[PDB]
Structure formats: C-alpha cells, structure tokens
Write a protein that binds this DNA or RNA. Structure first.
Lengths: 416, 163, 198, 52
RNA sequence: UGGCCAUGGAAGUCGGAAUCCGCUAAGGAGUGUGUAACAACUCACCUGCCGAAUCAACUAGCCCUGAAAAUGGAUGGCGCU
C-alpha cells in the first residue's frame, strides 16, 4: 500500500533526525550497513576482529564503549540468519541525552528500499548520509540493453541495480549463398530480426508500464549493432514509453555486464534530467507571472492564505527553507497563535509581549516549515514540489521570490 | 463600502455552508471576508465556537457582520437536523463505515422539525409537511423498522398542533 | 397515467365549480413559476388559483350535470393563455388585489410599449465602459469621472411603439423595468352574472 | 470589434452546423443524416466544434 | 435543498449508493452546455395559432455506402433502362 509506505518513510526520517542529534560524550557508535547480497557470517567475523582490535584502544571510556557496541551489534546479527533483502542498517552506541543520562541503544532494521551501500564506522557520532541519500533519490530509471545476442531489462535507483527480465535469441546468419534465395533469405532475416525488436518493445511495455503509465522517469536504451536505435525509433515501441527514452548508449559488452557499462555511460544524463524537470515546472510558475493570469502566489503570507482557502494546484518550496512555524502561547489568559518567522526574527524578538493584557508571550517550540508542508500538503491541494537553486529559473525562484509559492487552481486577488 | 472605506451601519449578511469543526481547507473568508473588515483566523474560531457541540455532522452558517463582529447562526436544513437526531456521536476518523445506519425511529421528534420550518413549502399545513420531511430522510428509514413511501398516506396525527 | 390524471383533473375543476359560484378569468401571459408561487402565497387562504387548457372546454359537462346553465356564457372566453381564480369573498375587491400584486419583469425586445418610458439623468454604476451603446440611437451620456452618467431626462419609447433590441438591452443593464405587467383580467363570473373589468 | 447580431448572422453561416462523422461533410444543423452518398447517409453526425 | 456520499471541488450537472414528498398545470434529488464552485444557458406538462390523422422500434426485397494495382478490356461482344 501507498499509505503504509509513507508511514515507513516518515518513521525512518524521524529515526534519522534523532540519530543525527544523538551524540555521546567519550564513546563511539557503530554505524553499520549490510547490503542485500552479503553473507552475514562475513559481517560477524569483521566485527570479531574489530572487537579484538578495539581491546587495544588506549582511552578507557572510548574503548569500553566500542567493545560494548560491537558485543551488542553481533547479538543483533545473531537474530537474523540470512541478510534481510533490501539490506540491513544497524546503529549501536552509547548516546548521551539530557538529565546527564548515559544510555545504550541498538537500532537495526531492514530499510524499505533495497540499497547498495555498505558502511562500517566507529566514530563519536552516527552516520546517516547513506540513508538520507536513499530517501532523496526516488527517481527510478528503466534500462533496456538490446543486442543481437539478446536483451536485458532493468531498473535502477541512485545506487541500486535491479534486473527485471531477460532473454537471448538465435538470430539467423548474415548471408545466403544462393543467388536468388539470397534476396529472399535477406528479406526473411529482416523479418525475424525485426520480430525480435517487436518482442522487446512489447516486453518493455509489459515491465516498465503499470496501469497505463510508465513507472520509470527515464528509459535508457543501450547496446551495440545499430539495434537499440531500431527499437528507439520504431512504431512498435509504445509512444508513452518512447516519450521517456532518455538515452541511446553505445556499450561494449552485453547483458548483465552490459548493464553496468550502460549505467556509467548514462550517469551524466540522469543528473541533468532531475534539473530539467525542475526548470520546466518553475518555468510555468513564471509564465503565470509573465502573463497577467493571476494563478500564482509567493511569500508565505499570501501562499499559505491561498493554501488555506480554495487551494493551490502545485505548491513549490526550496528544499531547505530556514523559515519556521512557531506556536506562541500566553501565561495567564491561555490565548495562542502561530507565526512563520525568519532566521533573524526567530532567534531574538521583543515583539512577543501580549500588549493588550500586558504579559510576556512565550514562544513554545517550533516545527520547521518545509517539513510542515511535507506533513500536511495533502490536507489542502497537493503536489508538494521541492526545488533547487542550480538552474537560472531555480535561483530566480529561490533568490527573488523567496523559494516559496505555488501555482494556483484558479485566479485570486490579494490585498494588503 | 462603495467609494473607499466607510461603515455607515454594516449589517451585511452572506451564506456560508458546512462547519463541523475549523477545517484546514477552510475556504471561509477570502473574497468577501477581508474587504469589509472581517478577518480570517478569528472569524474561523468564532465560526467553530458557534457550530461546536452540535452540529458536528455538517451545518449551515449565515454570517451577519456587525462591522467587525460576525454573528454565526445555525439555520436548520431538514437532512442536517435528522442526522443530528441519529445515533451520536462518533464524530470524525472512524467514522469511516460510514454515516448511514439509519434506524432511529423519530415519530414525534419530526413534529418539531416541521414546526421549526421557516413557514416555507407553500403548504396546506402539517398534513403535507409530514410527508415532505417524512421523505427528506434519505438515511433514517422512518419509524422503528418501517419504509417511507406509502405509510405516509395514512397519517393520523398532529394536523391542528403545528400552527 | 394521463387517463387517470385527465379524469382526476376533471374531478378537481368540477369540485372547484361546485364549491365556488364566483370565479375570475386571468391571462397568464409572459409569467414565471416564481410569480405563480408569489400569487399562490398572497391569495392562499381565500382564493384557489387554477390553470387549465381545453379540458376547461368541459364546463359544458358541468352544465350538463343535472343543474347549471349560465356556464354556457363562459366558453368563448377560455382562449389565449387562460387561468382561473376560484373564490368566495367579493368581485371589485379581488380585482383590486389582482391589479395591486403584479411584478416588474424586464424589457421585451420587439413587443409593444404600454406607457411612455423614460431614462432619468443618473450614473449607470460601472467603470470606463462602452458609451457607444447609449449614444448610438440618440442619448446624451458623458463619462463624468469613471461612471457613465446620462445628462438629461429623455423619453426613448412612447405609447404603442415597438421596443428596439439595443435600447431594450441598455434598459436591462440600467435595471429599468416598465415593460410587461404580471397578469391581466379578461372577464369575470359572479354567481351567474358576467362582468368585464367594471 | 464586431457587432453581436451581425456576428450571429455570420455564425449561422459558418459555425452552427452538423458534421458527418464519416465524410466530414458540412450539414445544416437540423440534419440527422448526411447528404453525401460516399458515406451512404451515415447518420453518425456531430456538431461542428466551436472556437473558444 | 449546499438532499446524501464524496472537501480537491459537485448546491441536478469529475464519479458513485440514492432517488422520495410539497406546490402542483408542472418541472428529473435532473438530458446536456458551462463552472474551482456557482451563476447563466439548455433539455417535461400545458396552453395560442393552428387543425386530422400521426410516430416509434424491428424486419426483409431491389439500389447505394462499405469497394485499392499495376499493357487497354471485356454480363462473350455490341449494346440494353
């Protein structure tokens, strides 16, 4: 289900927030990630020698901490017997927190996406750079490696490299050694060679499409032998699929070994793509400003007022705002309100006296905005679009307009 | 209010519908709200306080703006008052399956419903109004375990009491 | 249906003839359902309004029914868009109540003009809009700071004159509604005797 | 720009028609059947699309 | 009568379970068009002119549409209504 997946992402994001905060005085913390294919024994051994080494650590508080963590991460791994699919992510240590409370913790879990990123570390802190880099890069891209020998269809995350389906074929010989039959055999060879392409072009629809919509934001075709092109520019390959043909890549090698080659030759394009789509969206946002229209908005005050009401269509936000939603509160009267304060206005501000009554209006702690949108953009109007300051249209959005706004579902006049 | 910014008296009325609670998606103010001095969040909180504890299963909201003070009232819609006199109160979030139990009797309670009708209907008194509201019930299914349709034709009550 | 309904209406009109010996024949004319709802509300208690056709051509059968003559006199006046008003109060009072009720209803383009229609000197209630629509025929209109003001009291359409299309649309934009009427009285029936709005 | 009665005069003659689904024949708006023999009096008609 | 569900908005009008009463002369909890949503427009029952017959769904006979190939061309030919 989609809702259960969104809960598991929120769970993991919250886990990361805590682990980045954690910290512990003295001590170290086992960052650890065991990729899908790995043998867990291999990990147990590694740990066991990492243990034996750590027993010569000169510092006590560090030593005994590290030994403890390694003792306990081994015990976690004992509860699994094969590596869970989609990898494993363990995070031992002895985190410190408020109240002077030294507490041990051992968070292991199969992460929801497969991942292809091993890591081991002892250091003062935990390392969750891998994990954030697997929530950021959703963008699944489809690969199809055509060759005279055979095909390979496969999907692709940031790091993760899946193999969907494949086959090979006995295509005919190049030549027909009779004078007349030469011509017929040629025409016949052309028919079976094309038929193979027809099969590939159907299979790709069968694999990379789902509910009359392609599941992959690109569709890299690869290979050699002027074949990938024969697919690329045919009437057989479905136009919604062929719309997202993103590259024809000439690879040496074929099949599985062909795959990796096809990805490394593709790397540059799949980066550009994410920026291209961003440029396109904001480009439209600006079109509504360029023409009078009315169906745009900008600056929290206006934008959220548009959201609250007959909502926006698309809401565009620069992926980090500073800007933060605070929940202000009164001591005596119990009257309360909420405000969207800038980095300067949030840090120190004499504004927040109650004035009418005459008391110090205390600001109960914040929830940072971009995250606030991410929580509850669905309870409004939808399509929360994170953007960047890399493109010229991107920067103009971030710099000028404030990296916040949205394309509206109809024309609205604003006042004050 | 015509030329620039002048409240001569301002007893301006406009008819919003819906309002169990606040509503994030709201659509309460804009357009009509701000021009005319009525705000947005305060007007929403006042709208919540009026249509708080019953009705919480949809209402109506005529908003009489006394310059800056909005007067929210709950004018009755037949279907809304029938849903108010149902089997309360499982308000929101399960809920879910769904809001259509509809076996809650109301025999003499509907007499109150036809009485509170703002005259309306161009009726020949309650005898016909009974039929009207006695059908308006999409959910309720009339008395104990009855149908609406033709039991209505043999009414033997409240002809002279409702005026 | 439509045999049982036809016979059921026969039973309505015959009952309304038995109940009331006094009726009032009114033309429906260019009339709304809203107008008919208003006239039902005002004349609710005393009178009963009805709207028939050529099953009104059936007053013959009531006269046949071992009793009435005099209803023979009423058959020729059930022509045009006719609707009855059955009642028991009085005649000249009800005539005045019918005349007093009425409704505005905006200009009909093409039809005759009953009274001398005028255009008083006043603003339209608009911004810098088309003054050419007003000035096309022969009206003095200026743009005195935004609003299109008419600068003189002028008579556009006289009695028994055909109302043009462009002048009708301008009157509709100004919210000037002298044309139409509501409903007219053609003939009367009072306990056997007939009267003609006198 | 263009006078509204006159427009509707000129609309009558150009825009307010029925079009045969077979042979794209332009037909008077009252039409139930095509003229054209090539389509065999189709009856699949439709109203000419309007300019927005 | 912003009817119920659906709020992303469906007050007849993306959809779906409903689908009754009043006034009724008569208008569907609504054919469409159009709306962010309304509004506005549009589509029964009855009249006036009018004045006796008129309409629907099937079916089958001939004819037509469906019906495109290469030397010029073949109901045998001319021709035939």
């Amino acid at each position: 289900s989609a809702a259960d997946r969104n809960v598991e992402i929120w769970k993991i994001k919250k886990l990361i927030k805590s682990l980045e905060a954690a910290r512990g005085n003295g001590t170290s913390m086992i960052s650890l990630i065991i990729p899908p294919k790995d043998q867990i024994s291999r990990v147990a051994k590694m740990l066991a020698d990492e243990f034996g080494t750590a027993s010569n650590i000169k510092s006590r508080v560090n030593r005994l901490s590290v030994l403890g963590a390694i003792t306990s991460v081994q015990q976690r791994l004992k509860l699994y017997n094969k590596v869970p699919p989609n990898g494993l992510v363990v995070y031992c240590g002895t985190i410190v927190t408020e109240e002077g409370k030294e507490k041990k913790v051992n968070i292991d879990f199969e992460p929801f996406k497969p991942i292809n990123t091993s890591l081991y570390l002892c250091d003062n802190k935990f390392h969750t750079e891998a994990l954030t880099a697997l929530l950021s890069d959703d963008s699944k891209f489809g690969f199809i490696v055509i060759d005279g020998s055979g095909a390979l269809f496969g999907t692709l995350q940031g790091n993760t490299r899946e193999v969907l389906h494949k086959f090979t074929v006995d295509l005919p010989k190049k030549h027909g050694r009779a004078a007349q039959s030469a011509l017929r055999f040629a025409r016949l060879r052309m028919e079976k060679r094309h038929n193979y392409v027809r099969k590939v072009a159907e299979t790709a629809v069968q694999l990379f499409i789902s509910g009359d919509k392609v599941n992959v934001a690109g569709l890299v075709l690869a290979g050699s032998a002027d074949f990938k092109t024969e697919l690329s520019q045919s009437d057989m390959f479905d136009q919604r699929l062929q719309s997202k043909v993103l590259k024809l890549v000439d690879i040496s090698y074929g099949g599985e070994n062909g795959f990796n080659q096809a990805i490394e030759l593709s790397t540059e394009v799949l980066s550009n793509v994410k920026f291209i789509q961003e440029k396109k969206l904001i480009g439209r946002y600006f079109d509504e400003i360029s023409q009078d229209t009315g169906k745009y908005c900008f600056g929290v005050e206006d934008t959220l007022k548009a959201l609250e009401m007959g909502a926006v269509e698309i809401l565009i936000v620069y992926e980090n705002l500073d800007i933060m939603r605070y929940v202000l509160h009164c001591q005596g009267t119990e009257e309360e309100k909420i405000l969207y304060l800038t980095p300067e206005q949030e840090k120190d501000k004499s504004h927040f006296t109650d004035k009418e009554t005459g008391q110090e209006h205390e600001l109960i702690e914040s929830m940072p905005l971009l995250e606030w949108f991410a929580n509850n953009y669905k309870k409004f109007g939808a399509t929360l679009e994170i953007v960047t300051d890399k493109s010229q249209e991107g920067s103009q959005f971030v710099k000028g307009f404030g990296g916040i706004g949205g394309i509206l579902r109809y024309r609205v006049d604003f006042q004050g | 209010m015509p030329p620039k910014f002048d409240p001569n008296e301002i007893k301006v009325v406009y008819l919003r519908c819906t309002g169990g609670e606040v509503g994030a998606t709201s659509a309460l103010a804009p357009k009509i709200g701000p021009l005319g001095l009525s705000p947005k969040k305060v007007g929403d909180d006042i709208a919540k306080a009026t249509g708080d504890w019953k009705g919480l299963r949809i209402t109506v909201k005529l908003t009489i703006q006394n310059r800056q003070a909005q007067i929210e009232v709950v004018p009755s819609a037949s279907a809304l008052i029938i849903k108010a006199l149902k089997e309360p109160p499982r308000d929101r979030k399960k809920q879910k399956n769904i809001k259509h139990s509809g076996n809650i009797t109301f025999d003499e309670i509907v007499n109150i419903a036809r009485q509170m009708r703002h005259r309306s209907l161009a009726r020949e008194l309650s005898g016909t109004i009974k039929e009207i509201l006695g059908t308006a019930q999409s959910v309720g299914c009339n008395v104990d375990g009855r149908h609406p349709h033709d039991i209505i034709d043999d009414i033997n009550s409240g002809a002279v009491e409702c005026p | 249906d439509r045999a049982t309904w036809k016979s059921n209406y026969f039973l309505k009109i015959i009952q309304l003839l038995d109940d009331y010996p006094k009726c009032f024949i009114v033309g429906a004319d260019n009339v709304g359902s809203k107008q008919m709802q208003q006239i039902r509300m005002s004349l609710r208690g005393k009178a009963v309004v009805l709207m028939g056709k050529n099953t009104m051509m059936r007053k013959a059968i009531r006269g046949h029914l071992e009793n009435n003559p005099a209803l023979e006199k009423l058959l020729p006046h059930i022509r045009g868009n006719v609707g009855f008003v059955f009642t028991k109060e009085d005649l000249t009072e009800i005539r005045d109540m019918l005349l007093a009720n009425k409704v505005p209803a905006a200009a009909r383009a093409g039809a005759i003009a009953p009274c001398e229609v005028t255009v008083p000197a006043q603003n339209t209630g608009l911004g810098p809009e088309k003054t050419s629509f007003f000035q096309a025929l022969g009206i003095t209109t200026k743009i005195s700071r935004g609003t299109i003001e008419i600068l003189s009291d002028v008579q556009l359409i006289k009695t028994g004159d055909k109302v043009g299309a462009s002048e009708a649309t301008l009157l509709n934009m100004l919210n000037i509604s002298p044309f139409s009427f509501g409903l007219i009285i053609q003939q009367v029936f009072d306990n056997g005797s007939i009267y003609n709005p006198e | 720009i263009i006078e509204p009665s006159l427009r509707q005069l000129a609309q009558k003659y150009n825009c307010d028609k029925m079009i045969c689904r077979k042979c794209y024949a332009r037909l008077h708006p009252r039409a139930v059947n095509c003229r054209k023999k090539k389509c065999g009096h189709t009856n699949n008609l439709r109203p000419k699309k309007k300019v927005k």
